[PDB]
Structure formats: structure tokens, C-alpha cells
Design a binder for this molecule. Sequence first.
Ligand code: X31
Ligand code: X31
Ligand code: CL
Ligand code: CL
Lengths: 176, 86, 175
Amino acid sequence: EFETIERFMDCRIGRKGATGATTTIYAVEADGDPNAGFEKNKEPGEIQYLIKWKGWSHIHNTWETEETLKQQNVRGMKKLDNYKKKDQETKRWLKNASPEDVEYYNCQQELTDDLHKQYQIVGRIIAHSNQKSAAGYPDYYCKWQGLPYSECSWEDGALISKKFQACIDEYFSRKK
Amino acid sequence: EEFETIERFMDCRIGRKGATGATTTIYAVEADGDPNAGFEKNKEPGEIQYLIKWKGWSHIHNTWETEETLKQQNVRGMKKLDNYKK
Amino acid sequence: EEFETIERFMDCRIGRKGATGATTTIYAVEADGDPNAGFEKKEPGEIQYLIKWKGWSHIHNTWETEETLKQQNVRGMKKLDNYKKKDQETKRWLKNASPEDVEYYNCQQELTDDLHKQYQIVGRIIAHSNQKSAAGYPDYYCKWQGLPYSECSWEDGALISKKFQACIDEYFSRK
Ligand SMILES: COc1cc2c(N(C)C3CCN(C(C)=O)CC3)nc(N3CCCCCCCC3)nc2cc1OCCCN1CCCCC1
Ligand SMILES: COc1cc2c(N(C)C3CCN(C(C)=O)CC3)nc(N3CCCCCCCC3)nc2cc1OCCCN1CCCCC1
Ligand SMILES: [Cl-]
Ligand SMILES: [Cl-]
């Protein structure tokens, strides 16, 4: 019925309207980053968030504003309050911080950042649909890098060939 | 005629209606995909099927099968079906 | 009217009848022992899950059964269905997977279960309370291994000092 929020993945200041379906990685690749030429300079922006939608997989992460979360009558809005609360607590005990703490925080906080971006490439395909679409695509059973095998999904076969045809090739070639 | 025999009841399931038959042996499901694919009880194909292990065939031939479909094929040994139910 | 709340399912296992509860947190078993110690079957089994609680840092992961989750009105049962299914489905698929596929599944599950085993290691204490306890222990704000900085948690100084004194120390040897 209504969307739900599972995790808040990152935060950012970005172009006004760089929120919504058009901000997923496979739209930005197939269409273009609405948030393209942004230095935070040259252009006033907005606080946008990176949402991991309940039900859907880490590839459908879209960026939204507080407004669009409310405008979309989405569930999980308390999660929005906590993410903002613990962000203020984290900025607090890093204002009085030795330079080597900022070294740690920025080194670390950037490892999790990669690890998160890897949750979107497909580690191996595992199955496919009997049914095909009008356009002639099965749907695929993807395993995602970093995420365990219980983080697998039935993914659009038209969708994943655009970036992982090679992973589709090796599924079929490990039969004959 | 020439009937099939139900050897063991391997597993239970709530599967898309139709996701039964010879389309549920591995070597099909690997060649064509699965008729059940990604089925949640959200969609209401809803039906209860059984991985039936057959007599005189290795386990790679097992199939998911309804009461409906077992009785259509007049399989033997429906005595263990309801036994399985109870 | 204070119930608990399943956050994420981390692991099932067959386990000694009654090897559940907070006697199962990692820090309990080091203290005393493992309730599921030396199990085989000899012994009535059971099907026990490792829950990550909403509210609590990963140290507090406890193995539980579908019973003791309901028995304690634990909220988030819908997520135990979506997981029992996702397990049966993937066990069927081990019935007939090619050894290659089965070996990939062993590499990538042994890796996974590690990164999980370290969400319980502290890589940095970065604050302490202004308030000690009976025993001279502040609570400590931990940075966790694997996790981001939005998983940091105020945690019993007493408890953390029992396995990560080195970290509270280097904390103070910089202030
Ligand atoms: C929960 O609602 C939805 C979400 C869907 C979704 N997600 C999860 C994004 C996150 C939330 N979004 C915001 C904030 O703007 C929109 C997009 N992606 C997708 N594709 C998925 C395939 C990838 C191939 C690229 C092209 C397609 C995109 N299909 C979604 C469908 C959703 O149900 C629509 C109602 C029922 N349907 C179901 C099937 C189609 C029509 C009837
Ligand atoms: C059920 O909520 C809780 C949980 C607590 C918890 N966890 C994560 C439980 C472990 C075992 N579980 C089961 C089902 O077996 C579930 C969760 N650990 C801990 N310690 C953490 C401290 C140091 C460690 C050793 C000292 C014991 C352990 N204190 C918990 C406390 C919980 O509330 C009670 C606090 C109430 N407030 C709120 C109102 C105002 C008064 C104070
Ligand atoms: Cl993970
Ligand atoms: Cl993480």
C-alpha cells in the first residue's frame, strides 16, 4: 500500500528536485544525475536523504527530502527523527576532537561508504523466471555483493542486463 | 492403464496456481525458469502443493503436485496423501 | 507496556532446548558459559534465531525460538515469516545446486558471518558520561567495527571495560 523506510543510508545537500525515482543508480546511468553539476557552490540546495526502502533492494535506494517523505504519506517517519537525533549527537562529540580523530572518522566513515555502494552490484545470478515479459525478459534472482544470501531478490531481467549482462551470461553458461 | 506411484512426500508449499507438473523438475526450472518464481501470498494464485518423490525414479524427477492434479492422474498411493494431511 | 522489537534476523541454528535468552549474549557466555555448549542429537533439538534488537548494540544479540519471541510479545513477527520462507526456499536450492554454486555459497557466507562477528568489536570510545554508577564506571559511546558512525551507542562502561579496557584507555590518553 504505502512505502516504508528501513534504513537511512546517507545525507547530503543536493539540487532542488533531485529526489525520487529518478535518483536511483540505474536511472542516473540510463538517464542522468539530476544532481549533476553541484558543488554546493554556484547553487543553493536542500537536505536530501538516501532511503533503503522496505521490501525493495539496495538498488532502489532513492534520495528524498523531509517534505517528500511527508508528501508521500510514507511509513517509518520516526526513523527520520532518530537519524537526525543521532546525527546531532555525532557532530557534538566531534567538535571537541583531536585532528587524529577526524582522520579516523573520515577514513572510517568512508569505508562504510564503499561497502554500501557495493550492496548494489550483483555477485551472482541464481535463478530466473519461467514467465517472460512482453519485452521478452525473465526476472532474475540476484545475489548482491557484501549482502548475505538471505538478501537475495527477484530482480527485473530487463533492468539488470543494462549493467550486469556479464552476470547474466555466466548464469546461463554454468548450465551448458 | 499405466499409473504413477507416490513414494514419499518431500515437502509442503503455498505456490502460485499452476506452478505444478513437469515444469517443477529441477532440469526444467533450470532450463525455462520456475513457474512459482517469486510468489508471495500477496498475489493470490495461492494454492497448497507437494514435492512428491516418485517410485522408480531418482529424486531429480520430483515434482510439485496438487491433490487436484494427483487425482487427475489417478496416481497410486493417495492413502499417504491424507496421512500426510493428518 | 514496554515490549521489545525484532530489528533484523541474523541466524538460525538447531540448539539445546532452552539455550535462549540473555544467557546467550556474547558477553554472557564469556562470563559464565554457553548454554548451547556441546550439543548434538542425544538431545531434543529446537530451532533458534539470533535477533538484533531495535534499541541495542550488536553485543546484545540473543538466540531465541519462535515461542519465546511470542511468549514475550516481541514486536516484528511479520519479519520472522519473511525469513522462515527465505530459509526453506534456499535450503531446497541446496538440494540440487552444482558444487560450484555450493562452494561460492560457502565462501560468501563465511565472509558475511565475519563482518557480522565484528559489529561487536569496539574500534573507538569517543565519549563517556558525566555520571558514574555504584562502581566507578561511566557509560561509554562506542564506535563499532563494520558499522557506521550512526550505530554508535552509549554502553555500560563496566561491561566494555571487561573486554576493551585498551580502548577506554587510549580514549583518556588523548583528552
Ligand atoms: C511499492 O511501490 C513501488 C515501488 C517501485 C519501485 N521503487 C521501489 C522505487 C522506490 C519508491 N519510489 C519513489 C519515492 O519515488 C519509486 C520507485 N521500483 C520499481 N521498478 C522495478 C523494476 C526495475 C526496472 C526499472 C523500471 C521499473 C521500476 N517499481 C516499483 C513499483 C511499486 O509499486 C507500484 C504498484 C504495483 N505495481 C507493481 C508493478 C508495476 C505496476 C504495478
Ligand atoms: C527490555 O528492554 C531492555 C533490554 C536490555 C538489554 N537487552 C538488549 C535484552 C537482552 C536479552 N533479551 C531477551 C528476550 O532475552 C532482550 C534484550 N540489555 C541490557 N543490559 C545492558 C546494560 C549493561 C549490560 C549488563 C546489564 C544488563 C544487560 N539492558 C536492557 C534493558 C531493557 O529495558 C530496561 C530499561 C528500562 N529503562 C527504561 C525506563 C526507565 C528505566 C530504564
Ligand atoms: Cl551485512
Ligand atoms: Cl553496515
